[PDB]
Design an enzyme around this catalytic site. Structure first.
Site, short mmCIF file in Angstrom:
data_model
loop_
_atom_site.label_atom_id
_atom_site.label_comp_id
_atom_site.label_asym_id
_atom_site.label_seq_id
_atom_site.Cartn_x
_atom_site.Cartn_y
_atom_site.Cartn_z
CE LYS A 109 -11.42 56.39 -63.07
NZ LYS A 109 -11.00 55.05 -63.57
CE1 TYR A 110 -1.49 58.77 -66.98
CE2 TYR A 110 -3.17 58.34 -68.61
CZ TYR A 110 -1.92 58.80 -68.28
OH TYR A 110 -1.10 59.29 -69.27
#
EC number: 3.6.4.-
Lengths: 211, 490
Positions: free
Chosen positions: B1-2
DNA sequence: CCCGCTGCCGATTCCGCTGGAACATT
DNA sequence: AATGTTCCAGCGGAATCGGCAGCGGG
């Protein structure tokens, strides 16, 4: 430091001829010159523009000896290009249908350069020509004007319409004349201007000729 | 995930064997671990100052943790690094810090190695952030925490697997008891020294991965492939200053405004215009007008055709290249066309030519999508990814014309001695490691100011030339070059 | 007309990059 | 004056999340 450009652009009838189906060379040359003066004015550079028209109605020339030096008007001297000099081109619909010559405009350009190279230092002198090359060329003096160009140390630039030899509209990285845009008068005009420019400084001059 | 911040819990051993220096006066391994954690804090406080870090001590005498197991001391619950915590660990450096450690909590006890893992799990599980990697660095030298018990060992292995299934990866760097890695622990089961890098590898860096643009590469009528425009190289620069109030060191909350039409009174963004005074006359037009006269196309890339990589001469550089890579989630099947174009363009050695428009109202600008081939090996050398490189193309006036009125060649014998010199100085350029002296010095001065320790370090400029090294490694041939045809002549 | 979920879509926050405008220097 | 640096301003990606509609039941 400074620079001085003396534009000479044709307004003769043949150069301002009716649209064959693409454009009119008068309109194209007007667009090019208005772009040039536009860049000069909005760039706020210390350069002078002297605009002269050859093939006009009258002859408002500094020198007009008899028949020669006719239909040429020195509209502007070497002075800072203002919005007046730009609205002038914007307000110059009239072609003034008296096609006389173009080399007369050249010698007038040198005359005005020497007439206005006083009290203002200049390192560069440039003269621009816009011509359909459709009038009868004048051979009153060619060698001496070449010598004048050599001694005055000036460089000129000649622009000619689509006639060089798809629906070419203005510019598309392609052909210049649609099917056949040159005549024999224009053919010999291109020949003579090419040989003059080559004699001036050679192949670089052949490079400095643009539609 | 960013937005997944990385986590790291430091689990160091304080039982008996790190408060004695194996009959040496070099460094007690407890001090070595504290040095390592100091290094990691000072690195991630400017590299990854959003990751969570924690320090936990086990084998101590007194205890502190949310479960109240004995002999487990959580010095710091995991959170973003700061100067306070680096100082709190700095008070345990050296032998003076060793005795300070002795007196605040006190080493020597029967730890469990299954309660401590449970405490680490609770630490990881008590934070309200999205975590990308949970990792625990175990700083220990002992091999058999189970030297007298097998039930304890089985419970430790159970809880280790119990950590592993929840995505908590335990890695162990062993503080070499005799100072060299010959103590081969059999715990390849529990874990998933390489430590000098962890002392100092990354003086300064950053972390991210993001699109920077989501555009449509349109095949000029309707064939549109969605595609991301990534930034492979960026020219990072020092963080902007913060206006801070002298008396209390507080952010000052600036506010800018325009007013006083010779009266005194606030001007709304609607009662003003934008003008430019050219020559004598003043041209006036309003803000949206001065925003809309630079508007040609919609954002995206449009093919102008194809040119072989040969005739775009590679000194026409003005803007660092970007990286086209297919994005399917916007329009499906884009990656198929992207791969087809990549393969065909690579085999033909032809780069695409596009009209790039990154934002909504911005003039178009010509770019070349030069294909690049992904390179990789058995060692998995993933150093360039597959896709396109946007080389920005100059227009006509981004170029400049130079004097050019100078042309003088040299005789074909100075070339030989210059060849001698250059092959003498020939060296492999790099993989990395030319870090910015200005940026590194700024980071070091800021470290010193925040930790107010002694005075700021001097970053060793890798960029400086080793002038004496070149002088000695050339020897007596540069002077031979200086005076072969051209003496000073006085 | 109510009542209730439940998709989902808009806007915020947080970053980060770029551009434009202002600075200070030889 | 030519330029590099700093500063300010604006746009977009990404994640989150809340409520705005519209759609079934009562």
């Amino acid at each position: 430091n400074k620079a001085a450009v003396v534009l000479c652009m044709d307004v003769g009838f043949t150069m301002s001829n009716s649209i064959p189906g693409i454009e009119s060379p008068f309109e194209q040359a007007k667009k090019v010159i208005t772009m040039f003066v536009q860049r000069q004015v909005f760039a706020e550079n210390k350069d002078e523009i002297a605009l002269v028209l050859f093939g006009t109605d009258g002859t408002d020339n500094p020198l007009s000896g008899g028949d020669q030096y006719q239909n040429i008007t020195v509209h502007r001297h070497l002075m800072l290009p203002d919005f007046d000099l730009l609205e002038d081109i914007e307000s110059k619909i009239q072609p003034g249908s008296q096609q006389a010559d173009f080399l007369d405009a050249l010698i007038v350009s040198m005359d005005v350069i020497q007439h206005e190279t006083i009290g203002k230092k200049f390192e560069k002198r440039h003269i621009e020509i816009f011509t359909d090359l459709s009038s009868r060329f004048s051979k009153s003096q060619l060698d001496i004007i070449i010598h004048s160009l050599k001694k005055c140390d000036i460089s000129l630039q000649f622009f000619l319409p689509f006639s060089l030899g798809g629906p070419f509209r203005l510019g598309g990285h392609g052909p210049s004349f649609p099917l056949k845009g040159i005549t024999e008068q224009q053919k010999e005009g291109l020949e003579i201007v090419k040989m003059v420019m080559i004699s001036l400084e050679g192949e670089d001059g052949l490079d400095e000729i643009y539609s | 995930k960013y937005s997944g911040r990385d986590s790291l819990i430091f689990l160091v051993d304080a039982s008996k064997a790190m408060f004695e220096s194996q009959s040496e006066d070099e460094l007690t391994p407890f001090d070595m671990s504290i040095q390592c954690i100091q290094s990691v804090y000072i690195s991630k406080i400017i590299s990854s100052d959003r990751d969570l870090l924690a320090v936990v001590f086990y084998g101590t005498e007194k205890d502190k943790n949310s479960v109240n197991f004995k002999n487990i001391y959580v010095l710091q619950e995991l959170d973003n690094p700061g100067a306070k915590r680096i100082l709190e660990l700095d008070q345990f450096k050296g032998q003076q810090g060793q005795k300070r450690f002795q007196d605040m909590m006190g080493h020597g006890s029967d730890y469990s190695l299954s309660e401590v893992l449970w405490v680490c799990a609770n630490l990881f599980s008590d934070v309200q952030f999205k975590m990308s990697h949970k990792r625990i660095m175990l700083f220990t030298n002992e091999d058999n925490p189970h030297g007298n018990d097998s039930a304890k060992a089985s419970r430790a292995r159970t809880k280790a697997g119990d950590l592993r299934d929840t995505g908590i990866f335990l890695d162990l760097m062993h503080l070499k008891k005799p100072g060299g890695f010959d103590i081969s622990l059999f715990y390849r089961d529990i874990i998933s020294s390489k430590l000098e890098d962890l002392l100092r590898k990354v003086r300064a860096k950053e972390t991210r991965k993001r699109a920077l643009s989501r555009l449509k590469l349109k095949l000029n009528k309707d064939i549109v492939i969605s595609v991301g425009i990534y930034n492979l190289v960026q020219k990072a620069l020092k963080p902007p200053p913060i206006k801070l109030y002298r008396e209390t060191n507080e952010p000052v909350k600036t506010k800018t405004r325009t007013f006083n039409t010779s009266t005194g009174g606030l001007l709304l963004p609607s009662d003003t215009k934008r003008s430019q005074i050219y020559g004598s006359r003043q041209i006036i037009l309003e803000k949206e007008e001065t925003e809309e006269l630079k508007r040609f196309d919609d954002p995206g890339l449009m093919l102008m055709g194809f040119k072989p990589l040969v005739l775009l001469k590679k000194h026409h550089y003005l803007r660092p290249s970007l990286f086209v890579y297919p994005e399917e989630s916007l329009v499906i099947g884009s990656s198929t066309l992207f791969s087809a174009l990549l393969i065909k363009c690579l085999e033909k050695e032809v780069a695409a030519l596009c009209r790039y428009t990154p934002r909504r109202n911005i003039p178009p600008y010509f770019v070349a999508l030069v294909p690049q081939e992904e390179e990789l090996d058995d060692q998995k050398i993933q150093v360039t990814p597959p896709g396109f490189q946007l080389v920005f193309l100059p227009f006509a006036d981004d170029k400049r014309k130079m004097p050019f009125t100078e042309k003088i060649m040299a005789t074909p014998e100075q070339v030989g001695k210059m060849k001698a010199i250059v092959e003498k100085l020939r060296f492999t350029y790099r993989s990395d490691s030319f870090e910015n002296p200005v940026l590194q010095q700024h980071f070091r001065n800021l470290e010193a100011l925040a930790l107010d320790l002694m005075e700021p370090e001097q970053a060793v400029d890798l960029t400086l030339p080793k002038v004496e090294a070149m002088n000695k490694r050339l020897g007596s041939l540069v002077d031979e070059f200086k005076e072969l045809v051209y003496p000073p002549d006085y």
